[PDB]
Ligand binder design. Structure first.
Ligand SMILES: [Zn+2]
Ligand SMILES: [Zn+2]
Ligand SMILES: [Zn+2]
Ligand SMILES: [Zn+2]
Ligand SMILES: [Zn+2]
Ligand SMILES: [Zn+2]
Ligand SMILES: [Zn+2]
Ligand SMILES: [Zn+2]
Ligand SMILES: [Zn+2]
Lengths: 249, 249, 249, 249
């Protein structure tokens, strides 16, 4: 938090002055891996090996995916979060949206001289609006932006999960899965204040025969994940009953 | 021990006659991985994958680190030890010290036609000497040389741990951590016969306010690791009391 | 508390009008022993027997010692406390300090028409400064006086324990044990606010080789006793680690 | 053992230069009681109180009895042993045998500059021959002298128990109990090497109707105590069967 983190960012800046934008990331990964290899941390060493290999390959999306997994299970690591956000920003620059890249750069600058994971979550959500904008839907970006604004003033780690659910809805909307009406209804529900009515809406559309069993199960599992990080038991039971009804019945 | 080991060294010699010094190591790693993949050994297969990838990359130090971890946890594997020593020799040749390279080459020659892990430990300690000489301190090399001489005539696997502690002292001496006086005192203590007085000296300097909590703790768990392979309970308890005092108090 | 206590003091005053100052104490002890013998209290009857025998002998110091023990383990008894305060009052009159005797007399007068053990503790500490002044050190009396003032306005039973520690320091200072510098440092530490720094100072001087194992153990167990009546677990563990390091190592 | 014991003996010598021979013992007891009262040792403090009271009374025999009990149960304490031997010597001088007084004085002189309990046992046995000589029997003194000679060259704490058995035999011989023949037989048996034959002889005389149930039982538990400090299970069982036969049958 302000120490041993600004050094990594500084080194990334020096190696990025050339403009390669790829070797600086590798050097940062190598710095983090040296620190986590001297300890008895093999799970982090292997994961950083895989991340470095993927980054050198060019498949950064898988790297951000499993790094997101790692930071979610164990968020005590902060340098790992820093290199994660660096990769997220670099991938955003590749995607073709420079304003999101600038926002993530400011988030990195503020997080390096701080130590709060809420900036990590905010950058993750910026990446999610970047992906949504790449997908084609534009109206979804508004709710993501509202969540990003609300996170920088609340610091609730539960907001990113809702944005993940929105990303799942956008992904399903494109392949040929659940129609637009359900997507808009669920987006509005998660937008205003609604998490319980989302379950009821999903069940209603499933019974009426508008949603296949796989999509409903995926959305309800995401809702259950959101509810499990909120300390709500009247909604965990409600989602459990919903999924149980959906799968076998 | 004299069989199925001299074959690997012979093949490394044939492929090294070209002078590439990189592909022969890869071929040896591939020979070892084939033998350990035909079995139900996935922990060795993955580690050899990582080692081969690192060797092809050129970051041999991480490979020697995790191979050292593997051989310390599992000393029964001897071909893995052989390729380990080959990697140490190749890295030493890169570092710029040819005399240490010659010494470790003779160690490989003797170990191939034998089967004793004490040569592996001796080569490791020669590596640590190489690293210390690269760091800048020269007086530390004398104690390492004395330990290396004593290991070839005793075969006690605990001598490498003391050299590892010396390497840690040298590393801390360079970054900006604990001053020279403590380093010299601890080096002399581990040199002559002293392991218990080292703990007392570290505690004394901690209480007087000359050593930060991190470096003292590091040296203390290193001493605890040294004592845990010596069958000493009067020193394990002493080190445990020392660490408990240092961390929370 | 104001009843069945003022009667004993009144009788002591009547029998002390003659001026023998020895038989009145015996009569008070016999009054207390009659009351505690009619019950099923044998541990008190025997102890009062011993106290009366010692008082008639003239060795009041042993009597005040074991009566202090008794009142510390079981402070519900108040008449026993009253005769105890009478005993240090008489002993102080023998020692040659009349002002301390006057202070103890006022404390007896206030305690008889009250019932608070804090006056017992205050008179105990007065006895402590009397003994300290008899020993020869004068600077130690100031901290004892400060503790005496602080007890009459706080009523915390832990203040007498610090005075006991100061007494131990003064006693060790005279025989030929720990030098003056450590005594002054520890006195200042216990004076201002420090109990944790005392342990560190004692350990530091032990490791440097200025204090024999017996004196350090005595001071540390006294500090442990002080901390055990303060509801502190971060200091009980700290003192336990200190003593464990000191004795066996 | 050579320290903080010679000081007590020196003080006893100074106070005994007057020739009172009674107040020096009281001063030594008071020194020991001060040391054992500062601790949490109430069992030793009370017993020293009783010993001092008995010594001032003039009934030293009870004091030596319960001090013997104390040193037998817990012989780690050595100063109490020193004051015990001092009381033993003083009582010997009162009895009227100056040669035994000289012997025990030399024993005190050697024990003070040493620390071995075998001198305590030797002085105890000297007291036993003194008591036997006072009783009237003279032939019994020879076996006691032989045991005393053998103890100073063996250091076996089991020899004093046999002398205690001899003392019991002498005591029973005088009141009107068991006749001389059994006493001589048992004395010879205990003298040469016999402890098992003593049990058989006692049982034989009991069955023949020469010894009442009380004296036989007394000698039998004395023999059992002797055998219990010898690590013999073939004799403990033999004594247990003997006592069981004697009491109920
Ligand atoms: Zn690795
Ligand atoms: Zn519902
Ligand atoms: Zn149904
Ligand atoms: Zn594989
Ligand atoms: Zn009584
Ligand atoms: Zn401490
Ligand atoms: Zn120590
Ligand atoms: Zn007492
Ligand atoms: Zn028999």
């Amino acid at each position: 938090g302000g120490t041993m983190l600004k050094e990594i960012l500084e080194a990334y800046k020096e190696i990025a002055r050339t403009g390669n934008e790829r070797e600086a990331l590798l050097r940062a990964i190598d710095i983090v891996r040296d620190k986590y290899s001297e300890k008895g941390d093999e799970e982090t060493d292997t994961l950083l090996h895989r991340v470095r290999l993927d980054v050198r390959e060019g498949n950064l999306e898988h790297a951000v995916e499993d790094l997101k997994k790692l930071v979610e299970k164990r968020p005590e690591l902060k340098d790992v979060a820093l290199v994660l956000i660096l990769i997220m920003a670099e991938e955003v620059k590749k995607l073709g949206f420079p304003e999101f890249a600038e926002k993530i750069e400011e988030l990195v600058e503020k997080f390096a001289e701080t130590g709060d994971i809420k900036y990590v979550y905010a950058a993750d959500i910026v990446y999610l609006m970047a992906l949504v904008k790449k997908l084609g839907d534009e109206e979804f970006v508004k709710i993501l932006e509202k969540f990003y604004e609300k996170l920088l003033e609340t610091g609730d780690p539960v907001y990113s999960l809702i944005a993940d659910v929105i990303l799942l809805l956008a992904k399903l909307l494109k392949e040929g899965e659940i129609s637009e009406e359900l997507a808009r209804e669920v987006a509005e529900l998660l937008e205003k204040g609604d998490l319980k009515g989302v379950v009821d809406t999903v069940l209603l559309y499933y019974l009426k025969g508008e949603v296949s069993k796989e999509a409903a199960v995926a959305i309800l599992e995401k809702i259950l994940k959101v509810a499990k990080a909120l300390g709500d038991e009247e909604l965990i039971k409600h989602a459990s009953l919903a999924i149980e009804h959906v799968k076998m019945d």
